Amino acid sequence: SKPFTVPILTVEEMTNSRFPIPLEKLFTGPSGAFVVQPQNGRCTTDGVLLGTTQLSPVNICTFRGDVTHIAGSRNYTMNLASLNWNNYDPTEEIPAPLGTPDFVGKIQGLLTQTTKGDGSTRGHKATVYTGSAPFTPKLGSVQFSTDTDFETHQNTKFTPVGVIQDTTHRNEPQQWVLPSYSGRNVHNVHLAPAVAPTFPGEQLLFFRSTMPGCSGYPNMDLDCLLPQEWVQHFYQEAAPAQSDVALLRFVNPDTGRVLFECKLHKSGYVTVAHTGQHDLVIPPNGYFRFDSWVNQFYTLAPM
Amino acid sequence: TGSKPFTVPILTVEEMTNSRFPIPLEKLFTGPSGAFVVQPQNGRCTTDGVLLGTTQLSPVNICTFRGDVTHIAGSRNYTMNLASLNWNNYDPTEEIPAPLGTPDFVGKIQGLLTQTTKGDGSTRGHKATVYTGSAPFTPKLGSVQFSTDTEXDFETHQNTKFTPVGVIQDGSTTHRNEPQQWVLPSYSGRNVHNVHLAPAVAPTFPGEQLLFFRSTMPGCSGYPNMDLDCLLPQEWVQHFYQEAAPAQSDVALLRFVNPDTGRVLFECKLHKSGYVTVAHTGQHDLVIPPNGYFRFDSWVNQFYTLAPM
Ligand SMILES: CO[C@@H]1O[C@@H](C)[C@@H](O)[C@@H](O)[C@@H]1O
Ligand SMILES: CO[C@@H]1O[C@@H](C)[C@@H](O)[C@@H](O)[C@@H]1O
Ligand SMILES: [Mg+2]
Ligand SMILES: [Mg+2]
C-alpha cells in the first residue's frame, strides 16, 4: 500500500481551510461542552472530501454569479454559479455550494464585475451577513450590502477580506455556529459530523489564524481542523489507512528533537494529550511527520 | 536504490492557484514573447525545490503588504513602512529583490487596507490602490504608498495589512493598456537597477514556445488588461520545495492527460530551473478539458524533439 504522509510545510507556510488567510499558530482547549462541526477543512486521511470542502485555498468564502439590484437600498441579490461559472445544482448531496462560509458572521470584502461587451469593470466594498434571512446559498442566492453601478447578466465576484462587528465587544462572528444554508426554518442537510476527543485526557488541536477586522470589535479567532494543504495532499494521495489513528510527531529541525506528538484521526482531525486552554509555543521551522498507525487505546505523551 | 523519484501534483489546472496573484488558474496559454522579456519574480522555483526571486510558499500572501502606516493630514494617501509576511522586521540588505510576495508587474492593484488597534481590538478597513509603476513604489527600500477613497482614520504604530483583489485602469484613452504583466517594477525606484532577480526565461529549442498557466484577474475600475500568466502553479512550487527530488537532466518530459478518459493530449518539457515549453507556433488560448492534469514520464536529453501540439 502507498505509505501515508502529511505535508512537511511549517505552520506559517500553510493556509487556513476556513478562510483564505495564512495559519499563524497552534491552539488547544476544552471543547467537550460545545459542538465543533465546521464544514470547510473536512477531509479523511484517505482523501474523501466532506461537508462543503473543496481544494482551492483562494475560493474559500468567495461567491460568483449574476446580480440584481434591490430597489430602494444599496443591496444586491446574487444568483450563484459554480466555482468555475457553470450552473449551480442544488440537488447535490452537500450542505451548500462548496466553499460557502461555515460560520455566522458579517464578512466584508469587494464585489467586482466585468461587462462582457466592452471589458469595462467596477468594484465596491460589500458585506454578506451569513446569519440573515436572505443568506440561502443552498437555494442558490445570497444578498450583499454595498457602500455606493452593477449591471444585470454580467459575471460578478465577491472576494472576502475580513469580518466586522456592530454593542458588546467580540460577540460576533461566532465561528462555531453554522449558518442556516437554506434560510429560516429549514434544517441543514448532508453535514460533515461533529468532532470531539473520545480518549481520556485528550483535546482537539486547532490550526489557528486571526481574521482581518474591517470595522468594530470583532472576534477574529478562526480555528480549522486541517490546513488546506493537508486537504490537498490527502485528496491526491488517497493512501490507505491501516488503523483509525495516525501518530504524528512535531519536529524541531534546529535540534532534530520531537516537541510533541498527536493523533490524526482517519476521519480528519487532530487530538493532543492536554487539559486546559493553551497557546502552543513552537519553533517557526517546526513541522509534522507521520510515524505509525496505532490502535484505539494508544496513550499520547503529554503535549 | 538511488535518487528520489521526481513527480508533479495531479491536481487539475482548475484546481490549482496562480503563483503571481491569489486567484485560481483557468486555462493554458502559449505565445511568442514578442517585445517583452519574461522575467516574473513570483512563481519561481527549481524542480529540486530552490525558491527564486520574491517567491514564497503561501498562495494567499501573493501581492499582499504588511506594516505600519503614516498619512499627511493634504491628500487620502498613506505611506506603509513594510514588514515581512509574518510581521518580522524587513531588512533592505537581504539578498532578495523586494519583500517576498511583492507584486512583480507594473499596474494599479486595488484591494482593502485593514488595521487592528492592539490595545482594545478596534478595527477598520478601506478600499485602497497601489500603483506599482509610481515613483513612491519602493518596496526594496521598505516603503510603498497607497491611495484610499476617503479622507480620514488609520492610526500610526498599528499593524496594517493590504489584501489584493484585482486591477484597475485609468488615465488613458486606450483600453487594456495596463497592467503590463511582463514589465517589472523598479523595486528601489527607476534610477536604481533591480537586484537578485530570478532569471529571464525563453524557449531555447527551435520550434518551441513557453507554456503558461493563465488566470483572469478581477477588474475593479476602467478597462484593464486582466490576463495573468505564470510559469508554475503555486501548488507545484509547494510540492518541489517539500520533495526536493534531484533533477536527472535539464528537462523533465511531462504528459498532459484527460482524467475522464486517461488519454494523452500533448507532451511538454519542464525545465529544471522551473518553466515549461511546448512544440507550437502562434499566440493562442489552448483548448483543453477543464479537468486535465500533468504526469512526469522521464528525464530526457537536451535534444529531444517534442511531438507538435
Ligand atoms: C465604526 O467605525 C469603525 O469601527 C470603530 C470601532 C473604529 O475602529 C473606527 O476607526 C472604524 O472606522
Ligand atoms: C470609472 O468608473 C468605473 O470604470 C468604468 C469603466 C465603469 O465600469 C464604471 O462602472 C466603474 O465604476
Ligand atoms: Mg507529546
Ligand atoms: Mg504533444
Residue numbers in the entry:
A (entry chain B): 224 to 371, 374 to 391, 394 to 530
B (entry chain A): 222 to 530
Passage from the reporting paper:
Binding of human norovirus to histo blood group antigens (HBGAs), a critical step preceding host-cell entry, has been the focus of a substantial number of biophysical studies involving nuclear magnetic resonance (NMR) experiments, native mass spectrometry (MS), surface plasmon resonance, or crystallography as this has been reviewed recently. The highly conserved HBGA-binding sites are located in the P2 subdomain of the P-domain of the norovirus capsid protein VP116–18. Here, we present an almost complete backbone assignment of the P-dimers and uncover spontaneous deamidation of asparagine 373, influencing HBGA binding. In the assignment process we discovered that N373, located in a loop directly adjoining the HBGA-binding site, transforms into an iso-aspartate, isoD373, within 1–2 days at body temperature.
The deamidated form of Saga P-dimers was then subjected to crystal structure analysis in the presence of methyl α-l-fucopyranoside. Well-diffracting apo crystals were obtained belonging to the space group P21, different from C21 as observed previously for the native form of Saga P-dimers. Upon incubation of deamidated P-dimer apo crystals with 600 mM methyl α-l-fucopyranoside we obtained a co-crystal structure at 1.52 Å resolution, in which the isoD373 isopeptide bond is clearly visible in one of the two protein chains that comprise the asymmetric unit (i.e. in one half of the P-dimer). We also observed binding of methyl α-l-fucopyranoside to the two canonical HBGA-binding sites in the Saga P-dimer. In the chain with unambiguous density for the isopeptide bond the side chain of D374 is rotated such that one oxygen of the γ-carboxy group forms a single hydrogen bond to OH-4 of methyl α-l-fucopyranoside (left). In this chain, no unambiguous density is observed for residue 373 and the preceding amino acids, and so the density does not allow us to determine whether this chain contains an N373 or an isoD373 residue. In our crystal structure of the deamidated P-dimer complexed with methyl α-l-fucopyranoside two binding geometries can be observed at the same time, i.e. one in each crystallographically distinct half of the P-dimer. Fucose binds to the modified binding pocket in much the same place and orientation as observed for the native protein, but the hydrogen bonding to the side chain carboxy group of D374 appears altered as shown in Fig. 7 and Supplementary Fig. 23. The altered D374 side-chain orientation and the loss of one hydrogen bond can be explained by altered conformational dynamics of the loop. Except for the loop carrying the isopeptide bond, the overall structure of the P-dimers is very similar to the structures published before.
